Amino acid sequence: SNFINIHVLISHSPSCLNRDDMNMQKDAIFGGKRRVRISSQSLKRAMRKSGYYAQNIGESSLRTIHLAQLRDVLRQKLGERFDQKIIDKTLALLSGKSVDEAEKISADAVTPWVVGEIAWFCEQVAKAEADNLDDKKLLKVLKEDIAAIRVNLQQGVDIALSGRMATSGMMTELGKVDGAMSIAHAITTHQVDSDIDWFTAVDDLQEQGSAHLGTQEFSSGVFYRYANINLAQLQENLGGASREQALEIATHVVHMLATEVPGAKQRTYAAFNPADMVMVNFSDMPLSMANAFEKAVKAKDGFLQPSIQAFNQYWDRVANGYGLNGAAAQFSLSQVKQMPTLEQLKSWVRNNGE
Amino acid sequence: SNFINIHVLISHSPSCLNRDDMNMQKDAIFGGKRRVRISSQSLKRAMRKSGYYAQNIGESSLRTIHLAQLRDVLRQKLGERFDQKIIDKTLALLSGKSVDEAEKISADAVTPWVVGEIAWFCEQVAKAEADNLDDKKLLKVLKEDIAAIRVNLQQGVDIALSGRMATSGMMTELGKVDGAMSIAHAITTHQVDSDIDWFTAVDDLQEQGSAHLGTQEFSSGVFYRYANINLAQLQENLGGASREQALEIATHVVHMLATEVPGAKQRTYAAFNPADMVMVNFSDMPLSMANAFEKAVKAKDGFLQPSIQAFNQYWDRVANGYGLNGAAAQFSLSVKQMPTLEQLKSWVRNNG
Amino acid sequence: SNFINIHVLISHSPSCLNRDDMNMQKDAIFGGKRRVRISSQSLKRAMRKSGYYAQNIGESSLRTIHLAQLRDVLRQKLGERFDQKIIDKTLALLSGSADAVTPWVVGEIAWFCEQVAKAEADNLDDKKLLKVLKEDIAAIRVNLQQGVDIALSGRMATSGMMTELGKVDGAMSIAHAITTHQVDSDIDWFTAVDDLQEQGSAHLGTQEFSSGVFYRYANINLAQLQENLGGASREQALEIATHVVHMLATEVPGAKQRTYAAFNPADMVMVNFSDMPLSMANAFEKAVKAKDGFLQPSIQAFNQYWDRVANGYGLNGAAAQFSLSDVDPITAQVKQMPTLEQLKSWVRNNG
Amino acid sequence: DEIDAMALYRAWQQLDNGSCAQIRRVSEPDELRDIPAFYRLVQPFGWENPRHQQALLRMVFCLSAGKNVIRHQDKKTGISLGRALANSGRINERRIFQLIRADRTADMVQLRRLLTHAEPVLDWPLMARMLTWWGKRERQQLLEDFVLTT
Amino acid sequence: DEIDAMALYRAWQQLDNGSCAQIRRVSEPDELRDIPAFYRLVQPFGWENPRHQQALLRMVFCLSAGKNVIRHQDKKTGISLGRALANSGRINERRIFQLIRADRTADMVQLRRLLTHAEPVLDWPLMARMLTWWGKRERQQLLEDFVLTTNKN
DNA sequence: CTGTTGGCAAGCCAGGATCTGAACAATACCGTCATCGAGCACTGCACAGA
DNA sequence: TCTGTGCAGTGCTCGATGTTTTATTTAT
RNA sequence: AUAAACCGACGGUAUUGUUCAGAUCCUGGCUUGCCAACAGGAGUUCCCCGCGCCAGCGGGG
């Protein structure tokens, strides 16, 4: 099968894991009721900035709109390998912007960069210089082998997972990436009416009253996390990697989706809870189990137990309803192979679900 | 029964499956209430570009306005069967445009093309000039057996289903196709006030704040999908295909209408939800069930259950009031009842 | 009574059923507020070109007209302008015990009589006459085999009818259909993705569309229908009328339906006999406001309007109503029909 | 009969820090109905008359962006909101489209975000008049004023 | 399908001193389902219908704060509970918040104490409707009427 | 068979700052005036003679 | 007893062509 | 039978790809719910039946 679906139910103690410009919890209406929400971009950054990512996958991408600051970073990191003039020219050709000595050079938008990828481009720009090859003709010939370029995304796997957009430069032809990972905004399986914490700040030099009064919205919740990985797209985005390496990467995402939690407000709320349930299945078609909670789960000795019930029940309805026979395994603390430990589930995924 | 009506209730988690010029969710007023909308053209393109279509139906058509680029594609694809001269004239006659070596040659409008259909045409063109038959009379001859042309649409079924028009070239006379499938815009059974996601883009070289602040509309929704297939028209559009051939194609549409979801914003919202109810009904006149939701569905343990219930109640009202007795079957996860979609599909394959 | 009034309330999902030369939805101002409109001519053609019409009207039993059986009454009708020599010569060359005769039949034959009368005077016959009147003869022969269609809808846009009596109006009159409520139309902003183009689409456009609870009105002139059927009976005319009721409830214009698919049947159908045919459009002159949809308040506004004015407007007479809804009913003077077929039978049985 | 826009503007300006903070933390116009400080602010401007309620909700919710975000400036019609947002040179035209296309409550939320960003200098009684009706005509004129300025 | 509020008000005012005293003795509304005199009172007001009974529990529990506590009056809108509590001038705004923020059964206890404290002159059927739909909308309008009336004086 | 009453419900003071809000490419075509005569089609026409 | 080349007889589609068009552009 | 009558404005079409809202913060000090009180009065219970001193005692419902 090409798609690996990942399902996570994870319960959080009272907290504010993701908020907006008014410091209100992000939410969403589903089933006609308010669900507290953690956005997909919050989860993705939490993962790519995590220690686990750094130890098991590598360095995350460099995302910036500031080309002048980027110019200086590249001049230092690639200064021993390439002349400053070709480092500049390379960045200029990629971004479509002029790179001089100006203190402020802006890209069109925040762009994901991989230093190794730019380094690769430097080798091509240098060679074109030595062959007196036109800039327009360099673009043409490099366009004929995208895979060679995508090999460098092994130094920036988060791009291969989540994609890259480009509106200016050679990147509009050479740097377009269709992300291999699809991921949903996490939402609570149940209705939530968030709590409000009314706080003070006591001023040690002020005896009458406090120096500041304020409020902070928070709530607990059982969240459903969904994501899938297009294994073919992942292999292609990595320049032609094997299924093994794609499964290796997919397994790491499984781990992170079960353990990684956004750092927002955790210093003062500390909702450091691991997943209570992880479900992984292979399929020919991406499949979300969100409609298990279309009808808001109601509390019955917690939300967690009825949520896993609703998940399993709906899973069974869809499995034989649509005749889905792809490999499936399940791990929980409370046909589908049961796994006592997360580690056994992870090895199961690495072995292509066998 | 000449018509196969298809009814789908499908629920999506928070997403943005179809948006307009300002990147806001498409919508529509129905029953005085805003419904989130997915255009029929979005549905049709999601189906024709899908893996299921490729495996079960074949190749989708080539839709383009750039004849110079098309010219080069045909030369690479029909080169070992015809000489470059014949390929160029064929495109020229069909499009009504001068096919030379220009870098940019543009058609009147975007037009669907079928390679197999073009291949069939250049045979005629070759035999035409061989028999010293000019173009004016070639057209007169070809107009006499359009069915022989339509057999090529078995290589481009999405045209047989969704249609084609042209205002220049021989396609004006020979390529006029009235699609066999009718399909509505998917609308939510209920009122939706869309959500707004306030997002940031954190810059790794910017320690203070973020480099971009923005907003993105999104929502959930239980959608009603409707489509019907004109079997007799589908047979005619395929050059005189059998009813079994039309029925099998209809069955794939049923499957796709229940499972295919547009790809827009799915990389970051992942609403990969299959339908919770599918209903197929044979009739003499097309029958949409949309008025089941004219009074917008109020939530009651979700929108899905009261939507299906509203659908069933209105179905009975119409059947009892209009005395309708065409064959009908219903698959649901929440009239002949089908436990699985596959049984439902066998049913359709067997003329109900 | 001589007139059958047919009232339909029909709800359409998002669509563009009737548009103008800018591709904008047709509309109308009613009660000072914009209503989406489906034109009379659009609605009537949807009926006249439908399959149901072709089977029940186009293939009727009264369809065919036999010039042979009409010889006697034609002989006395044209007998004061023409003598039996020409009248019978004409009657036979057109074809190669009837009581009455359809007006346009008399008038068109009388024209042919004028031609052959002038043909004998100018002293030409054989093929010369049948060469000159070749197309004209072919025209009337076709029309003589479409008598019910002509009596119901009137003559076609190309008929070959020659005289003033040949200006044949339909016995049914179809009004423009308008929404009961005010409408601000939606816009669909669309793309066309080019399979050979990397950046962006090859075309962009907009299309106006909307939903709408429409009020359809039609009346049937029975005497006119009978008179244009060679003197048919009330029962035979009521049988035709049953088909009109059915079509006004179920037939929808095909425009844009391939891509919007608003295939909705009527939720309310009412028929009433009167001496003076009246539209009940002023039930919605004050535009209906939405309350759990537009459909329920529209039927409600239709019922309340009937209760208020029917007596004073002289809408005493047989009245029946079919409805898919359980909205509080009109006055008990209107007989409730649970199915459309029961409503249609009620029409056949003269009410 | 008509809401004294400048009086309300002054009342909001010299509001105590407490009452002001209680109003500012609102996330949408209807939540002002939960705030006691809100009722006392708008009571002398005709709140108890239902005719004025929706207008007062919009006015105060726009003000709630902050005491110093909307700067009133007297006429020399006076600077409209559309011209004032363009005068800042901070607002992309796309965000104006998204504003004038937005449905109820969501429009006020997006407007207040724009006011926060733009910090406009305008004719406040003129903007209040616009907030009173807020029909489709007013929203199109907003966009066209913005465009005619740039 | 609505409870005759004025009839229930009259039924309580005419009720024998012994039966109404048995009712007042209750400490929380759910305890009224154990008192025989309670059913004796609310029987001609559709206690049989499960929808009516939760409202009937609230209405009687408020009526059971005393018998003379809630002086009903007639419209000249009609005085709401929020206006009435503010009209007494005995209730401060923080106690109003403790009503609209209180959880289940706790809210009715607080309301009871407030009625006893304020002894309000109001429109009883108007109040009865509030207790029937004791929702977020009723809490919000309650605070509105209180704040405005207080601020006016 | 019979169930109560008075008197009473607080005040002070306090609500923040920083900084940030994108870019590209693409919007269709046809017919709904007329004239003249010519070159070239259905289409019946009887037949003459097969 | 049916059918064949000439018609007479005309139903046409063919193409070049008669004419003729332009008016504006905030508010700051 | 009204510038009427007869009378479609029609056919084709993804708006797409990228994105933490984030860092800091006691709601806090003071306060009886209190004074008076037999659960006693009042034999209706509508029948069939068996034995009496006619007062009243029993078994079946």
Side-chain angles (χ1 to χ4, degrees), chain D residues 97-135 138-148:
Chain D
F97 265 101
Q98 286 166 347
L99 164 71
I100 68 109
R101 297 262 187 93
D103 292 276
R104 246 202 61 178
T105 98
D107 49 10
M108 286 306 111
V109 170
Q110 298 291 73
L111 176 54
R112 189 175 70 161
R113 284 170 170 156
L114 291 177
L115 299 167
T116 292
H117 190 181
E119 294 173 334
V121 176
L122 50 82
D123 191 341
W124 164 250
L126 187 55
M127 172 179 176
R129 241 170 300 158
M130 179 200 195
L131 290 172
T132 300
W133 309 113
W134 194 249
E138 284 72 27
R139 313 219 296 270
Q140 260 289 319
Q141 193 57 44
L142 192 287
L143 171 62
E144 290 180 14
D145 286 349
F146 181 94
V147 168
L148 279 175

Side-chain angles (χ1 to χ4, degrees), chain C residues 140-194:
Chain C
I140 189 174
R141 283 182 175 174
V142 171
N143 291 331
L144 286 168
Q145 294 159 356
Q146 289 159 358
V148 183
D149 176 42
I150 293 181
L152 182 58
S153 302
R155 74 181 191 183
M156 283 174 291
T158 311
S159 62
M161 299 277 189
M162 224 60 222
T163 56
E164 296 270 343
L165 278 159
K167 281 163 178 197
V168 185
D169 304 23
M172 64 168 175
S173 298
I174 294 94
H176 300 261
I178 58 177
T179 52
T180 65
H181 54 100
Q182 189 210 291
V183 175
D184 296 326
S185 291
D186 290 287
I187 312 288
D188 186 35
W189 192 87
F190 68 89
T191 56
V193 181
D194 199 288

Side-chain angles (χ1 to χ4, degrees), chain C residues 238-314:
Chain C
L238 288 167
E239 225 292 308
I240 305 295
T242 280
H243 297 309
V244 174
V245 170
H246 185 89
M247 287 180 304
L248 198 71
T250 57
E251 300 295 339
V252 183
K256 226 72 209 195
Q257 293 282 67
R258 201 69 68 254
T259 49
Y260 280 84
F263 299 110
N264 330 91
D267 281 82
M268 195 233 78
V269 190
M270 170 160 174
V271 178
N272 61 286
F273 294 79
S274 67
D275 300 314
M276 170 67 190
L278 294 181
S279 167
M280 304 288 100
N282 280 359
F284 323 109
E285 185 175 57
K286 170 181 181 184
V288 173
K289 288 172 284 188
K291 193 213 292 187
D292 293 320
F294 280 114
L295 185 56
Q296 282 204 103
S298 301
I299 298 181
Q300 189 172 331
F302 179 90
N303 290 343
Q304 290 172 347
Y305 178 74
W306 181 277
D307 293 338
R308 179 161 71 74
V309 305
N311 174 73
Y313 283 0

Side-chain angles (χ1 to χ4, degrees), chain C residues 40-70 72-84 86-117 119-127 129-130 132-197 199-216:
Chain C
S40 167
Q41 63 264 25
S42 175
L43 189 51
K44 183 174 181 185
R45 176 190 174 90
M47 289 165 63
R48 194 177 188 172
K49 300 290 181 176
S50 64
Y52 183 93
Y53 186 99
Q55 184 196 14
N56 294 269
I57 300 301
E59 292 180 326
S60 182
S61 301
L62 313 177
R63 172 223 323 173
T64 12
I65 298 170
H66 314 276
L67 294 177
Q69 309 177 7
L70 271 299
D72 297 324
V73 59
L74 279 167
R75 220 121 78 140
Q76 57 172 327
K77 249 62 180 303
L78 307 182
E80 303 193 11
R81 294 205 269 120
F82 298 91
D83 55 53
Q84 301 194 22
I86 282 159
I87 306 182
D88 287 90
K89 180 182 179 185
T90 308
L91 233 36
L93 83 95
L94 284 178
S95 49
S97 59
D99 196 344
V101 53
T102 303
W104 73 261
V105 180
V106 189
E108 292 309 285
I109 290 175
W111 178 84
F112 278 100
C113 286
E114 288 185 351
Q115 301 310 123
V116 56
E120 294 187 7
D122 242 299
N123 223 80
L124 345 148
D125 192 315
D126 336 45
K127 191 139 289 167
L129 190 64
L130 302 191
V132 169
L133 305 190
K134 177 197 171 187
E135 293 300 271
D136 308 77
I137 286 171
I140 189 174
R141 283 182 175 174
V142 171
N143 291 331
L144 286 168
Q145 294 159 356
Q146 289 159 358
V148 183
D149 176 42
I150 293 181
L152 182 58
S153 302
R155 74 181 191 183
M156 283 174 291
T158 311
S159 62
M161 299 277 189
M162 224 60 222
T163 56
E164 296 270 343
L165 278 159
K167 281 163 178 197
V168 185
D169 304 23
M172 64 168 175
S173 298
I174 294 94
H176 300 261
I178 58 177
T179 52
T180 65
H181 54 100
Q182 189 210 291
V183 175
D184 296 326
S185 291
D186 290 287
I187 312 288
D188 186 35
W189 192 87
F190 68 89
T191 56
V193 181
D194 199 288
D195 286 317
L196 300 181
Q197 182 179 321
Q199 270 273 22
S201 301
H203 194 80
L204 311 169
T206 56
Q207 170 71 59
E208 192 180 53
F209 73 95
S210 77
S211 302
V213 176
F214 290 83
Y215 170 66
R216 301 182 172 185

Side-chain angles (χ1 to χ4, degrees), chain C residues 212-231:
Chain C
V213 176
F214 290 83
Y215 170 66
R216 301 182 172 185
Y217 172 75
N219 59 70
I220 299 173
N221 196 328
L222 294 175
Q224 178 183 330
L225 186 58
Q226 301 175 225
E227 189 163 318
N228 277 339
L229 282 176

Side-chain angles (χ1 to χ4, degrees), chain A residues 19-20 26 39 41-42 44 48 199-202 265:
Chain A
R19 69 195 192 270
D20 61 20
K26 295 196 175 189
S39 76
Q41 62 271 20
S42 179
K44 266 139 68 185
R48 84 168 178 272
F199 67 89
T200 65
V202 184
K265 282 299 183 186

